[model samples]
Target: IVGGYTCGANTVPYQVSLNSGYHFCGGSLINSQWVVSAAHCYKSGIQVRLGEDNINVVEGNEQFISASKSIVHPSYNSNTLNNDIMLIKLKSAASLNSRVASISLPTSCASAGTQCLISGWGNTKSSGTSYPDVLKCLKAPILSDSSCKSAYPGQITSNMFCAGYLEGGKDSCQGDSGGPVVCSGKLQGIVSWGSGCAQKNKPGVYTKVCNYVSWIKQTIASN
Candidate 1:
């Protein structure tokens, strides 16, 4: 997923910035007009940086893009963390280059036990005490369909996918939500939730990328 395009031309994936100066989980460059991300990370008057790993460094392979619009899924419920996705219309089209290229959207559904990688600049520890200024990534296998179904006991919906190592100490943590869950070079899901960062019996949940394909395509089409 490295060297993928960002919303702004000449920008790369990790370089986008947030209003509060916080980093985002994941993003996609779609049709040179928009970049996709999690709704929770969307903010008014925000800036997104692309193509850099360390935001603190000068002269890094980075470019800045201003978000002209922030549209979150109307059904998104913060309490349940459901339908947590959004689109950002860049003020300008990004110039595609080595540092910036768009990632391919998935056409196939992800299955249980499929390994995927998640990356972000979110807190790494379970207690959320330390936040990494540098982007970080981790890999985990998709949980069995039945295993994921049992996590919520009754709340698990088809819209969600679960993943993690059940042994604990390995999962998407606080601030990791909305990050990419890449598998087979395609975006399979977005980091959504878990009982806690790296905890036992609580696998991370994600927004099913396959389930929202139409929603995504329609959004881009209408825009």
Candidate 2:
């Protein structure tokens, strides 16, 4: 993530490093066996790394688990990137501890103008080709839906929300998809897509977690 610093090892225990053959995207642990991420991050041979702050070195607390199943939102539109959320069911449930825990889902809608935090192992620059071995984090303010619509024009759907600065100094970039956007200690959004990394007037767009809370609960229960 651009304009971010390294986060503490235990600060985001719910964060998961997603890998197909290599590290690609980030995910949030919502429960023992369920992880929430962006649908666009999906690929074959998915595996999840938990209790990890760095991807390079093996930490004693880390656990690598294969994904048993992945379910993308049925209404997800790759063209518009709407409803871009997914759930991955781990082959075995994660063992919770100080270094690994699930984050709480939003109990209500996130208000505009609220500052939130996002974390990932994405690139530090828009033009960078490599991702950081350690997790990084940045803070962004939630933008009003109207302001976001003004930027995208008929593209900001209800299932999506916007965050970041209009001046464009800090934001999520490539490889950050499916990361958590935590507001008020709750998961309000999931990094989905954007026009460009930290570009002027092009804030990061996310999957509004509140909009799919019922679906998330039902999906987990049924599966």
**TM-score for each of the candidates:** 0.87, 0.97
**lDDT for predicted candidate 1 compared with the true structure:** 0.69
For residues 20-64, write the lDDT of model 2, one tens digit per residue.
Answer: 777899999999999999999988799899998878888679999
lDDT for each of the candidates? Answer: 0.69, 0.91
Instruction: Please estimate how well model 2 matches the true structure, expressed as its whole-model Cα lDDT.
Output: 0.91
Runs of candidate 1 exceeding 4 Å displacement = 1-19
Candidate 1 per-residue lDDT over residues 1-223, each given as its tens digit: 1211112323235223453455645566655667667777766776766665665675556767788888898898887777878878888887767876666678989888788777765667776466665666677888877888776676667778888877787676766656677888888877777776777788888888787788888987787
Best-fitting candidate, measured by TM-score? 2
Compared to the true structure, candidate 1 yields what TM-score? 0.87
